[PDB]
């Protein structure tokens, strides 16, 4: 019964902003690490935005340095992830991933396997 | 599919866990250990059952 | 001060599962042998499960072999009742009863007088 859920899709202008939410049910998403992952039509899956258990460690892909904000509510049993300053080369559809960390370390910067997947919501930045 | 009350090809047919569990299922991944260039076809599945 | 008390009741896909428990408060439930029974809209109360005091004999209704599975912790004071494969045939209340052997023979096929009841909790199966 263990689901994860995104939300907050759509069609939005370039240099417009936009948010989505990715919730759980079934189970109790504060002590997974939480990580954004995207495929844009013709490349492959790519990390964008990881943020820790707790919250205290984040990571983003470069690409997205200075536009992309995660935060997460242990107690809504939600992790959020802010989109400003979105480009046409952020069109692809939107994934949420849950996990426990494969290594050694706090920081969340490496990947690896992702227990839980959703269905995802697509993002679209045209105009 | 490996969790009590679930059902699949493997969790119906390979092997069945019943709803009154007490334990751990732990998993991780063997990509640079279970995986060749041409491919590891040493692990069989069943798809078919009576 | 002797309670019988259904929980986990609720609305299901068919196809579906769900997990219903029988709690007792005021009393050792472990002795007594417990059956879960149910009432169809316009239908009488049939057995669907029972199992022994120590757990070691089971019964179940034809309709439901192969779907329901019945089991007690003794050290939790709790029967378990879960459902699998989830028809709208099962659209009922149902209700757990404590009670004791009236009979000869270790198995609970027959029914007897039913001692102690709960207040019943709905499982409705419609999609």
């Known amino acids: 019964q263990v689901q994860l859920q995104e939300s907050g899709g759509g069609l939005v202008q370039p240099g417009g902003s936009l948010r989505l939410s990715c919730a759980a049910s079934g189970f109790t998403l504060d002590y997974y690490a939480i990580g954004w992952f995207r495929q844009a039509p013709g490349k492959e899956r790519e990390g964008?935005?990881?943020?820790?258990?707790?919250?205290?460690?984040?990571?983003?892909?470069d690409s997205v340095k200075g536009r992309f904000t995660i935060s997460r509510d242990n107690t809504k049993n939600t992790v959020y992830l802010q989109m400003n300053s979105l480009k046409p080369e952020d069109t692809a559809v939107?994934?949420?991933?849950?996990?426990?960390?494969?290594?050694?370390?706090?920081?969340?910067?490496?990947?690896?396997?992702?227990?839980?997947?959703?269905?995802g919501t697509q993002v679209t930045v045209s105009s | 599919q490996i969790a009590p009350g679930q059902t699949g090809k493997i969790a119906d047919y390979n092997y069945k866990l019943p709803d009154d569990f007490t334990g751990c299922v732990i998993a991780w991944n063997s990509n640079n250990l279970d995986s060749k260039v041409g491919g590891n076809y040493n692990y069989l599945y069943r798809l078919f059952r009576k | 001060q002797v309670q019988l008390q259904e929980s986990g009741g609720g609305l299901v896909q068919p196809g579906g599962s769900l997990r219903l428990s029988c709690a007792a408060s005021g009393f050792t439930l472990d002795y007594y042998a417990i059956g879960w029974f149910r009432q169809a809209p316009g239908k009488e109360r049939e057995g669907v499960s029972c199992?022994?005091?120590?757990?070691?004999?089971?019964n179940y209704a034809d309709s439901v072999k192969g779907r329901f599975t019945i089991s007690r912790d003794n050290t939790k004071n709790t029967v378990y009742l879960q459902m699998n494969s989830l028809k709208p045939e099962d659209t009922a209340v149902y209700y757990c009863?404590?009670?004791?052997?009236?009979?000869?023979?270790?198995?609970?096929?027959?029914?007897?007088?039913?001692?102690?009841w709960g207040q019943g909790t709905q499982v409705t199966v419609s999609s």
């Open positions: 009863a404590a009670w004791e052997a009236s009979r000869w023979y270790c198995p609970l096929q027959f029914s007897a007088d039913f001692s102690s």
């Open positions: 199992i022994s005091s120590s757990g070691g004999r089971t």
